[PDB]
């Protein structure tokens, strides 16, 4: 458990010099003790596979995750939460590589497992819905997409905080779906909603004193890492609309917040 937390810790810092050998060594050490087909081998493989994915070693990552999937199916059951977790990792990997059709069943299997085990209103079920919706969106299957995103947003808002990062992540993902469809106004709304609860977290309820960056942007026109992107998004949208003084406002406010869409997958 401690060994796993340390591997995760170096991987967070992107310090792959340390992360990989330790992992390769724990894998070697574990195989000697209990053989290859063991839950702990699958755990270290899963961690390593994700390090390879962050290094853009996609082929190697896919191999480890399948190997890890095979073991977990063998040692824990075909419908175990750990299996769902590994499928959600393959689906994310295929999706980020544009193999949406291949990812789609993996994501659906994980969802069926997660629902059965964790219950239909669990944040992990929501995480999954967001990935399914975004995977389907990239295939133009918009019919279910909006439903899944709202079901996931409902879960993340009730079960987690309204200031939880997943809430803003799911909102940007649904906004991207709206953008594909030409629903620019509906996306503009979600960007504004995200940027409002963000301001209200720093300097309370919006009145004539505490107005968010976008209200100032619209005024100029007339005359968290998940927030910096939303600022780049609404700035891009205002620019798309030909509202350049409002665009420059947010574009400058994005550069400040850092010190066109991005598909946020949840793992």
């Amino acid at each position, epitope marked *: 458990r401690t060994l796993h937390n340390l591997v995760i810790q170096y991987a967070s810092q992107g310090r792959y010099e340390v992360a990989v050998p330790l992992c390769k060594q724990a894998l070697e050490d574990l195989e000697k003790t209990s053989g290859h087909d063991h839950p702990d081998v699958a755990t270290m493989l899963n961690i390593l596979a994700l390090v390879y994915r962050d290094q853009n070693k996609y082929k190697d990552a896919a191999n480890l995750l399948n190997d890890a999937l095979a073991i977990r199916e063998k040692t824990l059951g075909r419908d175990h939460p750990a299996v769902a977790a590994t499928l959600n990792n393959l689906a994310v990997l295929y999706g980020k590589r544009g193999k949406y059709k291949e990812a789609e069943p993996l994501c659906k299997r994980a969802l069926e497992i997660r629902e059965k085990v964790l219950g239909k209103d669990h944040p992990d079920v929501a995480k999954q819905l967001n990935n399914l919706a975004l995977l389907c969106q990239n295939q133009g299957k918009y019919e279910e997409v909006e439903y899944y995103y709202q079901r996931a947003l409902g879960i993340y808002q009730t079960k987690l905080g309204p200031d939880d990062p997943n809430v803003a992540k799911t909102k940007n993902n649904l906004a991207s779906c709206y953008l594909k469809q030409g629903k620019f106004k509906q996306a503009e709304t*979600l960007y504004k*909603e995200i940027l409002t609860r963000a301001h209200e977290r720093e300097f309370g309820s919006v009145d004539d004193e505490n107005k968010p960056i976008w209200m100032h942007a619209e005024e100029r026109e007339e005359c968290s890492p998940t927030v910096t992107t939303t600022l780049k998004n609404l700035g891009a949208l205002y620019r798309r609309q030909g509202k350049f003084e409002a665009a420059e406002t947010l574009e400058e406010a994005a550069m400040r917040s850092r010190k066109p869409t991005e598909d946020i997958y949840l793992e």
Partner: nanobody
Amino acid sequence: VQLQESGGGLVQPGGSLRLSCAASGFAFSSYWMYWVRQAPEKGLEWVSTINTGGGITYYKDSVKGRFTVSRDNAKNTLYLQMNSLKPEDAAQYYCATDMSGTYRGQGTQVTV
């Protein structure tokens, strides 16, 4: 978290009712709000969704064009205008912070 439903009653097919949902114990204007229902021997069903503002509203296929979700963030109240009622709609109505009624109150009875 407190959610209290009201606005139910008996009406004739094609009739109208307005559901109210008072809230306290949470930042209401920082939440999306959901309307759910439950017919006697049937399972709990999602009816409507509303954003933090009023800009984004969603409805179950069967209620579309007949129902309208609204909210008064200052009054901390959620509303559901139920016009042109059908007996399919006759159920128990609850307001929640998600589909499948999490944090739902005692609800309000709607008869057709």
